[PDB]
Design an enzyme around this catalytic site. Structure first.
Site, mmCIF file in Angstrom:
data_model
loop_
_atom_site.group_PDB
_atom_site.id
_atom_site.type_symbol
_atom_site.label_atom_id
_atom_site.label_comp_id
_atom_site.label_asym_id
_atom_site.label_seq_id
_atom_site.Cartn_x
_atom_site.Cartn_y
_atom_site.Cartn_z
ATOM 1 N N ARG A 116 27.044 47.982 -31.035
ATOM 2 C CA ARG A 116 27.352 48.164 -32.446
ATOM 3 C C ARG A 116 27.392 47.354 -33.663
ATOM 4 O O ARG A 116 27.243 47.567 -34.979
ATOM 5 C CB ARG A 116 29.023 48.816 -32.437
ATOM 6 N N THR A 126 33.233 27.393 -35.061
ATOM 7 C CA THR A 126 32.741 26.093 -33.968
ATOM 8 C C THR A 126 31.377 26.191 -33.265
ATOM 9 O O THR A 126 31.474 25.880 -32.356
ATOM 10 C CB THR A 126 33.884 25.612 -33.146
ATOM 11 N N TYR A 185 30.189 23.528 -30.300
ATOM 12 C CA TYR A 185 31.309 22.662 -29.793
ATOM 13 C C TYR A 185 32.448 23.346 -29.312
ATOM 14 O O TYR A 185 32.855 24.338 -30.036
ATOM 15 C CB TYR A 185 31.624 21.582 -30.916
ATOM 16 N N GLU A 188 36.559 38.145 -24.325
ATOM 17 C CA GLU A 188 35.195 38.524 -24.274
ATOM 18 C C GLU A 188 35.229 39.574 -25.297
ATOM 19 O O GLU A 188 33.890 39.625 -25.777
ATOM 20 C CB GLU A 188 34.869 38.831 -22.691
ATOM 21 N N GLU A 189 36.018 40.460 -25.501
ATOM 22 C CA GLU A 189 35.834 41.562 -26.295
ATOM 23 C C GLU A 189 35.665 41.255 -27.785
ATOM 24 O O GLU A 189 35.172 42.158 -28.615
ATOM 25 C CB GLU A 189 37.175 42.593 -26.092
ATOM 26 N N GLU A 246 33.160 28.957 -25.316
ATOM 27 C CA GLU A 246 33.736 27.891 -25.547
ATOM 28 C C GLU A 246 33.969 26.909 -24.271
ATOM 29 O O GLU A 246 33.649 25.826 -24.395
ATOM 30 C CB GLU A 246 35.166 27.971 -26.164
ATOM 31 N N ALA A 253 26.054 42.974 -10.943
ATOM 32 C CA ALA A 253 25.957 44.271 -10.112
ATOM 33 C C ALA A 253 27.144 45.088 -10.387
ATOM 34 O O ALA A 253 28.372 44.523 -10.314
ATOM 35 C CB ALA A 253 25.992 43.826 -8.641
ATOM 36 N N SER A 311 -5.631 34.814 -29.635
ATOM 37 C CA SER A 311 -5.906 35.180 -28.010
ATOM 38 C C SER A 311 -4.563 34.847 -27.269
ATOM 39 O O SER A 311 -3.779 33.930 -27.516
ATOM 40 C CB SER A 311 -7.018 33.784 -27.460
ATOM 41 N N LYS A 318 21.680 44.150 -28.832
ATOM 42 C CA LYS A 318 22.174 42.812 -27.955
ATOM 43 C C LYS A 318 22.245 43.246 -26.550
ATOM 44 O O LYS A 318 22.240 42.204 -25.636
ATOM 45 C CB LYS A 318 23.788 42.630 -28.675
ATOM 46 N N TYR A 319 22.465 44.880 -26.205
ATOM 47 C CA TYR A 319 22.725 45.083 -24.819
ATOM 48 C C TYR A 319 21.305 44.994 -24.057
ATOM 49 O O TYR A 319 21.656 44.721 -22.870
ATOM 50 C CB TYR A 319 23.131 46.277 -24.685
HETATM 51 O O1 LIG Z 1 30.665 40.663 -28.352
HETATM 52 C C1 LIG Z 1 29.679 40.980 -27.276
HETATM 53 O O2 LIG Z 1 28.613 40.453 -27.006
HETATM 54 C C2 LIG Z 1 30.093 42.211 -26.462
HETATM 55 C C3 LIG Z 1 31.702 42.551 -26.119
HETATM 56 C C4 LIG Z 1 31.959 43.827 -25.484
HETATM 57 N N1 LIG Z 1 31.320 43.457 -23.987
HETATM 58 P P1 LIG Z 1 31.768 44.842 -22.833
HETATM 59 O O3 LIG Z 1 32.396 45.732 -23.676
HETATM 60 O O4 LIG Z 1 33.040 44.151 -22.034
HETATM 61 O O5 LIG Z 1 30.702 45.161 -21.863
HETATM 62 C C5 LIG Z 1 29.786 45.953 -22.472
HETATM 63 C C6 LIG Z 1 29.154 46.679 -21.334
HETATM 64 N N2 LIG Z 1 27.834 47.504 -21.547
HETATM 65 C C7 LIG Z 1 27.416 48.065 -20.666
HETATM 66 O O6 LIG Z 1 27.367 47.913 -19.640
HETATM 67 C C8 LIG Z 1 26.256 49.025 -21.374
HETATM 68 C C9 LIG Z 1 25.833 48.920 -22.617
HETATM 69 C C10 LIG Z 1 24.747 49.747 -23.066
HETATM 70 C C11 LIG Z 1 24.216 50.985 -22.139
HETATM 71 C C12 LIG Z 1 24.591 50.878 -20.935
HETATM 72 C C13 LIG Z 1 25.856 50.115 -20.255
HETATM 73 C C14 LIG Z 1 28.941 45.640 -20.175
HETATM 74 O O7 LIG Z 1 28.157 45.107 -20.167
HETATM 75 O O8 LIG Z 1 29.773 45.674 -19.298
HETATM 76 C C15 LIG Z 1 31.236 45.031 -26.050
HETATM 77 O O9 LIG Z 1 30.180 45.529 -25.684
HETATM 78 O O10 LIG Z 1 31.931 45.265 -26.969
HETATM 79 CA CA LIG Z 2 32.644 26.785 -30.270
HETATM 80 CL CL LIG Z 3 29.155 42.699 -14.814
HETATM 81 ZN ZN LIG Z 4 33.982 43.961 -20.566
HETATM 82 ZN ZN LIG Z 5 34.467 46.006 -23.519
#
Ligand SMILES: O=C(O)CC[C@H](NP(=O)(O)OC[C@@H](NC(=O)c1ccccc1)C(=O)O)C(=O)O
Ligand SMILES: [Ca+2]
Ligand SMILES: [Cl-]
Ligand SMILES: [Zn+2]
Ligand SMILES: [Zn+2]
Ligand SMILES: *[C@@H]1O[C@H](CO)[C@@H](O[C@@H]2O[C@H](CO)[C@@H](O[C@@H]3O[C@H](CO)[C@@H](O)[C@H](O[C@H]4O[C@H](CO)[C@@H](O)[C@H](O)[C@@H]4O)[C@@H]3O)[C@H](O)[C@H]2NC(C)=O)[C@H](O)[C@H]1NC(C)=O
Ligand SMILES: *[C@@H]1O[C@H](CO)[C@@H](O[C@@H]2O[C@H](CO)[C@@H](O[C@@H]3O[C@H](CO)[C@@H](O)[C@H](O[C@H]4O[C@H](CO)[C@@H](O)[C@H](O)[C@@H]4O)[C@@H]3O)[C@H](O)[C@H]2NC(C)=O)[C@H](O)[C@H]1NC(C)=O
Ligand SMILES: *[C@@H]1O[C@H](CO)[C@@H](O[C@@H]2O[C@H](CO)[C@@H](O)[C@H](O)[C@H]2NC(C)=O)[C@H](O)[C@H]1NC(C)=O
Ligand SMILES: *[C@@H]1O[C@H](CO)[C@@H](O[C@@H]2O[C@H](CO)[C@@H](O)[C@H](O)[C@H]2NC(C)=O)[C@H](O)[C@H]1NC(C)=O
Ligand SMILES: *[C@@H]1O[C@H](CO)[C@@H](O[C@@H]2O[C@H](CO)[C@@H](O)[C@H](O)[C@H]2NC(C)=O)[C@H](O)[C@H]1NC(C)=O
Ligand SMILES: *[C@@H]1O[C@H](CO)[C@@H](O[C@@H]2O[C@H](CO)[C@@H](O)[C@H](O)[C@H]2NC(C)=O)[C@H](O)[C@H]1NC(C)=O
Ligand SMILES: *[C@@H]1O[C@H](CO)[C@@H](O[C@@H]2O[C@H](CO)[C@@H](O)[C@H](O)[C@H]2NC(C)=O)[C@H](O)[C@H]1NC(C)=O
Ligand SMILES: *[C@@H]1O[C@H](CO)[C@@H](O[C@@H]2O[C@H](CO)[C@@H](O)[C@H](O)[C@H]2NC(C)=O)[C@H](O)[C@H]1NC(C)=O
Ligand SMILES: O=C(O)CC[C@H](NP(=O)(O)OC[C@@H](NC(=O)c1ccccc1)C(=O)O)C(=O)O
Ligand SMILES: *[C@@H]1O[C@H](CO)[C@@H](O)[C@H](O)[C@H]1NC(C)=O
Ligand SMILES: *[C@@H]1O[C@H](CO)[C@@H](O)[C@H](O)[C@H]1NC(C)=O
Ligand SMILES: *[C@@H]1O[C@H](CO)[C@@H](O)[C@H](O)[C@H]1NC(C)=O
Ligand SMILES: *[C@@H]1O[C@H](CO)[C@@H](O)[C@H](O)[C@H]1NC(C)=O
Ligand SMILES: *[C@@H]1O[C@H](CO)[C@@H](O)[C@H](O)[C@H]1NC(C)=O
Ligand SMILES: *[C@@H]1O[C@H](CO)[C@@H](O)[C@H](O)[C@H]1NC(C)=O
Ligand SMILES: [Ca+2]
Ligand SMILES: [Cl-]
Ligand SMILES: [Zn+2]
Ligand SMILES: [Zn+2]
Lengths: 686, 686
Positions: free
Chosen positions: B156, B215, B218, B370-371, B379, B481, B566, B635-636
């Protein structure tokens, strides 16, 4: 037995003498056929001497040369456009060399082309403070002027950077007898002084660690993508040329305008040292005109890389390196060092032929194109950075073995202080009046430490030599040593074998002493079971550097109050480093377990590495060491806590003090964090 | 005995179930008291379980929260300024949770404040190609419009970056039943589908690996210098808010202007999916108004770090980490993973209490925030980067254990492919119809490799999870996994313990299988005498990625001719890597010598490290791996040879083709050099 004493006893002054003679009969300018042939000779000999492998590593880098059919010179031109005085086209060659081919005439490497014509301003040594004095105090404007500056005090590339930022349209560099003529000594060939026709060659780049101007970050190999010239790193924007003091006299003698502000601006010539701009009344319509036609050219260079494989830890490297390219004959710079490297390789090889091998791998390097900006060492380190990162124990440089005959000079990381003290206590002093005494004794007597009674002076590393990539970019513990004075012919055609043999070191005993120091350091680094680094010596200096930088800041108490500028975090980190290093030393002394040993050897090896910040210093991405960088005002000098130092420098002149003091606080945080992070590498690992 | 089987047999589905219930009774939003208490609980339990040390590592980072007394919502506003329709202030809570406190209402973390009012444009998934279609093909201008985009397909934060660059003044994100309502399944609580009132929370940053926005580089410790908000990394410039499909229907149903260009733009609602701009004739004077009042606030977060010290190589770290903070109850994300970590720590501790220790140190991490952008892991890795650089063997992530119940999903470095194949051949399949068969058999049958018969699919690592700093910044071999589908309630209040227990994994057998895979990988990495990495598997994929990037370039044959583009150097480097890796494998198989072993283990460990470029990728200094980076469009997803990929992307649209193709050539050189340099780390060391 095969121990350090066997290695040391095998070194011979007469061998160093023979090698120096052999290396200095013809010029070995970087990128020339002569220097490639010498590379091949050294490669062959190092193989003969017994190294396991000896290869050439070549790169195609930007070099600079005069145009042989369109010579560089400077004129005084009258109002009609007649050139009434011309500077020399070459230095009068010394006795017996008047028929030697391929002596490059004096020039400033990497000068752009141009024929600027204008009024002179004399800028003393062209240091930052000299330009401050001109603009701020004397209200003299250098914009559109040709500046004439004396060599000395700081790296010539910094002078040119300073002149360019002042708005100069050209720079003339000259050697003043004040700085290059020692009282009571004769000019070459009858003594070691610079004659009036002598001239100092040298590059005028501001690379800040980048290596080849066209390929920063990556080796200049066969498929390298090059920057276009306009995007190259470090090239000067205005023409520059060096002259001797007979020619300088003719340019300075007519100078008018303002008087020199004080005696520190006066050299030794019989001229007023007026600042200008321009000439006195009768000559006011005369101008100075430069004619520079040099060309920058991508050219192949060749490093020789010799390997002596370790018996126990072949994946740990102790590196002895020094350059081979010279401006002309290189009688001191670099061949006095290269001859010493050659004899060290010979001695190690003698032990190897008898069945010995060092514990760790020793790499020996003959670097090319050092004189054009540390290019050979830096391209090779860029190509091999991952191997060096993870395996590099130490780098010992080996440029000029002598710059005087008075005492020892050592500049090195604090991690090597103890090694150097201990080694020098076991070596004989070569000095008159100290026969039967140790080198430690003579050195400490002649060059006392400014802070510790009964200790010798050891300086931090600056730059302007081939350890720069290893130390300030990659964070590998580095050191250097040579004989020094309490030199005039530097980079001139007069710097010959005869200069050394007649005036500096007739018996080659100072050369032998330097071979013992450099070779002994390499021996101990490559053979000691525990790496010979004392982390506690880093703790002591870190406190000294913190006191120093805090003292600079405390010149501005009101601002520190206003912006809440505290050094508390840096002193806390230094205190923590001190305690943790003390505990690590106890464990090192108190620990049959080769994994604990090597775990501990890795903590020792990675300690210098921990002072690296992968984001680099501000606008200098290749100066990554947080404790030491080359001074931003003088590449030769080291600066401690350089990120904080540069944030504080001339801060009273900054128009936005909030922003400037915020950046000081940012740099304090980066330094405190880096010191604490390095300390934590010495903690118990789990 | 104490071997892997003992470790695996000790893991219990019923324990994972008990832990999941325990972790999901109340919300554990980052920076809240609830989440600090859970950190303390986990710390206490990991100590109980037998870890040698368990500490909290705290940082003060930028977080974002709604204003509890000034709620976020969206309106349709008439010409008089009356708000005639308002989006929901909260999701209807699920059965039995209607009295639970501290459920954060739906919001987009790090949205700025604002009340923008304007005409809607519907932008499909707001992907790069969706905006290309709007501007270039449909001539629809998003400038000054409010964009409404469906969630799905890409991260997103990329949608918001794309909308901002299109000139949007706000973004509404919504969940379309096309993407979040599986046919023939009921909405929660009667099935696992998203109800019309459900809403996906989540951050909308574009950090590119930076960690805490204030930050970068660091750790955000007590003395950290912070950037001001205006210089922070990754924050969006326009307000953003998420809604459910009942509310989306009300915003979309009036849309006028242009028809959707094709069926791929239509979701499942009973609306035309007109692109706009604005509403159909009768409603043309109505507008959409956002009201966003969230605030960004520096807030303390807490990682739990557990250490199980290695018996033989305590200075080598194998890390199992996953996050603990959740948007609401975290029934799947992350507590299904955290419960599995908890049981793995319990099992390792059972062996430790009996006198066992792993060969290498195992670190266990419960990451915070993480979220809000991978803040806790990043960090901590910034604070400990030198230790991790020089000692980090591998990182295994441990977020959600399930996202479906169909088969295994593995994404990892090629260095772990062999380890994963071998481990899964020794584990039992939990799948119906595969009783008595291996997990390898069921996984390979359900998820065949696209290139190899009889092999399962393993994907490269993308990002959007806590391995990012370890893999793409620091170059430590990483893997993950979980169980997967052939998920709707993601980041909604409905993602509860009951969702998992009733609909995903009633017996907790898929959770147990995932614990076996993650735990078994950690066990082998921490205990195998030779590290379980096969460099030859990197050689195979490098050739696949080179073929892929060359194929992209070959869409432009005329330009490759014109600019002499090339790929020969990259294929040469890959060929060299293949040969050198083959020879290294022979030596590894053919070498009682613990130094040769550890020298060889260091070559294995530093191989992932060798793909790091310390200068980073263009404008993304924290994405330093040259083979893999998160897609610049999503990013995913992972992208291979990302520097060349981004140089080629949409190159036909660049106004200066000479410059654009020159940058493609530069990136080929960087990639060829990096592959050759990594190969050379596997050569004989001397
Ligand atoms: O800020 C960030 O880089 C990610 C923060 C946050 N990570 P998350 O919700 O804990 O995990 C993303 C979640 N996404 C997926 O597995 C997934 C993503 C796209 C397609 C299929 C699966 C995962 O990796 O377990 C997010 O995606 O909002
Ligand atoms: Ca930092
Ligand atoms: Cl995972
Ligand atoms: Zn998560
Ligand atoms: Zn999440
Ligand atoms: C040198 O090493 C020492 C260890 O011997 C190390 O000391 C650490 O200092 C930090 C920062 O001062 C301490 O941080 C505190 O940690 C506690 C929890 O353990 C917190 O509650 C504290 O926060 C409160 O107080 C702050 C200051 O007034 C407020 O800003 C804050 O909002 C809270 O109210 C605080 O974070 C840390 O506990 C010790 N660690 C120890 C003693 O083990 C020191 O940091 C090292 N020096 C450097 C430069 O790293
Ligand atoms: C993969 O590994 C192979 C080694 O098996 C490695 O091969 C090397 O390739 C380089 C570049 O092609 C070779 O470089 C040549 O070296 C000789 C001296 O040994 C030079 O004389 C050559 O230069 C001449 O020819 C050039 C090309 O036409 C001209 O541009 C130039 O001006 C000169 O006239 C050239 O530099 C090198 O010898 C081999 N090394 C070997 C065989 O050991 C290859 O580079 C590796 N791939 C990658 C991507 O690194
Ligand atoms: C420097 O010494 C080298 C090594 O002895 C000399 O090169 C040798 O010269 C002889 C006679 O010409 C040859 O037969 C050998 O093949 C050379 N050996 C090499 C290059 O390894 C060289 O002549 C000396 N140079 C000077 C100026 O004295
Ligand atoms: C300094 O050098 C210049 C260049 O060689 C001399 O000026 C040239 O003189 C020749 C022959 O008299 C003319 O044909 C050229 O046109 C001149 N060139 C220029 C650029 O002026 C000059 O005479 C020399 N000055 C002194 C004092 O020796
Ligand atoms: C320099 O020499 C000193 C004096 O021998 C060494 O310090 C001794 O080291 C031994 C062995 O670890 C200790 O048992 C002694 O207590 C030390 N004596 C001291 C500190 O006075 C020192 O390690 C040497 N430095 C090196 C090898 O870098
Ligand atoms: C999650 O489990 C933990 C660990 O058993 C529970 O925390 C314990 O609660 C009891 C009873 O209140 C206390 O006496 C212990 O001191 C706690 N131990 C800890 C924190 O380590 C906690 O109650 C459970 N949470 C839920 C929601 O069931
Ligand atoms: C949508 O929400 C807004 C805000 O609560 C409602 O508008 C407010 O209505 C109250 C009471 O009638 C007024 O005193 C405020 O001045 C209004 N505020 C604004 C910003 O308009 C609105 O009635 C709601 N709309 C619907 C359809 O429920
Ligand atoms: C995965 O399992 C295979 C099969 O046992 C391992 O490959 C064998 O390794 C042994 C010991 O080095 C060799 O003697 C055999 O020749 C190998 N068999 C092959 C390649 O078919 C492999 O090393 C394991 N992978 C790991 C441990 O990462
Ligand atoms: O480009 C560079 O960074 C340096 C190139 C070249 N290095 P170099 O002439 O071989 O050596 C500088 C030379 N300088 C000094 O020792 C020194 C410098 C200042 C004061 C006293 C002594 C040395 O380090 O041996 C130069 O200084 O022109
Ligand atoms: C050097 O000068 C000559 C003679 O004027 C000129 O013809 C040639 O182009 C120049 N060489 C260069 C610029 O390399
Ligand atoms: C110096 O001279 C030029 C005028 O030729 C001018 O542009 C520049 O601003 C001057 N600088 C000062 C400080 O007077
Ligand atoms: C060598 O030492 C002597 C004695 O101090 C001194 O007179 C002479 O100047 C020295 N030579 C050089 C080049 O420094
Ligand atoms: C939240 O909104 C309230 C009520 O309007 C206001 O008084 C307060 O300042 C806001 N809180 C913030 C911005 O943190
Ligand atoms: C879109 O709209 C604005 C006018 O409000 C304009 O400035 C911008 O250039 C437009 N873009 C295009 C591609 O028409
Ligand atoms: C669990 O598997 C069954 C059988 O294939 C399927 O009907 C059900 O939808 C699955 N549950 C989830 C949440 O995927
Ligand atoms: Ca380079
Ligand atoms: Cl030196
Ligand atoms: Zn030199
Ligand atoms: Zn020199």
């Amino acid at each position: 037995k095969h121990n350090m004493k066997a290695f040391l006893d095998e070194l011979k002054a007469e061998n160093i003498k023979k090698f120096l003679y052999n290396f200095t009969q013809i010029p070995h300018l970087a990128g020339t056929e002569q220097n490639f042939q010498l590379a091949k000779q050294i490669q062959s000999q190092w193989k003969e001497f017994g190294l396991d492998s000896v290869e050439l590593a070549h790169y195609d880098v930007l070099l600079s040369y005069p145009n042989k059919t369109h010579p560089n010179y400077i004129s005084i031109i009258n109002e009609d456009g007649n050139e009434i005085f011309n500077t020399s086209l070459f230095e009068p060659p010394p006795p017996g060399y008047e028929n030697v081919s391929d002596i490059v005439p004096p020039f400033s490497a990497f000068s752009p082309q141009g024929m600027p014509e204008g009024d002179l301003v004399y800028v003393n040594y062209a240091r930052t403070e000299d330009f401050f004095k001109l603009e701020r105090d004397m209200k003299i404007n250098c914009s559109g002027k040709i500046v004439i500056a004396r060599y000395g005090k700081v790296f010539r590339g910094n002078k040119v950077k300073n002149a360019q930022l002042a708005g100069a349209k050209g720079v003339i560099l000259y050697s003043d007898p004040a700085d290059y003529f020692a009282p009571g000594v004769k000019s070459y060939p009858d003594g070691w002084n610079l004659p009036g026709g002598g001239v100092q060659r040298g590059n005028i780049l501001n690379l800040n660690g980048a290596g080849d101007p066209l390929t920063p970050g990556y080796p200049a190999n066969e498929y390298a993508y090059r920057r276009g010239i306009a995007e190259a790193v470090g090239l000067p924007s205005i023409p520059v040329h060096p002259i001797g003091y007979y020619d300088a006299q003719k340019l300075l003698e007519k100078m008018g305008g303002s008087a020199p502000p004080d005696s520190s601006w006066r050299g030794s010539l019989k001229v007023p040292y007026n600042v200008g701009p321009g000439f006195t009344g009768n000559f006011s319509t005369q101008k100075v005109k430069m004619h520079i036609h040099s060309t920058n050219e991508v050219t192949r260079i060749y490093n020789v890389i010799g390997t002596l494989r370790g018996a126990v830890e072949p994946d740990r490297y102790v590196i002895l390196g020094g350059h081979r390219d010279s401006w002309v004959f290189g009688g001191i710079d670099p061949q006095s060092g290269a001859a010493v490297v050659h004899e060290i390789v010979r001695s190690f090889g003698t032990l190897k032929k008898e069945g010995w091998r060092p514990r760790r791998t020793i790499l020996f390097a003959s670097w090319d194109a050092e004189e054009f900006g540390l290019l050979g060492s830096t391209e090779w380190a860029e190509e091999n950075s991952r191997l060096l990162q993870e395996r590099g124990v130490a780098y010992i440089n080996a440029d000029s073995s002598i710059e005087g005959n008075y005492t020892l000079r050592v500049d090195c990381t604090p991690l090597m202080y103890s090694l150097v003290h201990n080694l020098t206590k076991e070596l004989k002093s070569p000095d008159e009046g100290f026969e039967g005494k140790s080198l430690y004794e003579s050195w400490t007597k002649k060059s006392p430490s400014p802070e510790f009674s009964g200790m010798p002076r050891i300086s931090k590393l600056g730059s302007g030599n081939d350890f720069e990539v290893f130390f300030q970019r990659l964070g590998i513990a580095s050191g250097r040593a040579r004989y020094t004075k309490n030199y005039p012919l530097y980079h001139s055609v007069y710097e010959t074998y005869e200069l050394v043999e007649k005036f500096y070191d007739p018996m080659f005993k100072y050369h032998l002493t330097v071979a013992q120091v450099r070779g002994g350091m390499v021996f101990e680094l490559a053979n000691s079971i525990v790496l010979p680094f004392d982390c506690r010596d880093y703790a002591v200096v870190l406190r000294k550097y913190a006191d120093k930088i805090y003292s600079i800041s405390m010149k501005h108490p009101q601002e520190m109050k206003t912006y809440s500028v505290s050094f508390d975090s840096l002193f806390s980190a230094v205190k923590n480093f001190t305690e943790i290093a003390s505990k690590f030393s106890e464990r090192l002394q108190d620990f049959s377990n080769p994994i604990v040993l090597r775990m501990m050897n890795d903590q020792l090896m990675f300690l210098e590495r921990a002072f690296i910040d992968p984001l680099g210093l501000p606008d200098r991405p290749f100066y990554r060491h947080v404790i030491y960088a080359p001074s931003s005002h003088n590449k030769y000098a080291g600066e401690s806590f350089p990120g904080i130092y540069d944030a504080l420098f001339d801060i009273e002149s900054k128009v936005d003090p909030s922003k400037a003091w915020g950046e000081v606080k940012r740099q304090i945080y980066v330094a405190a964090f880096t010191v604490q992070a390095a300390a934590e590498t010495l903690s118990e690992v789990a």
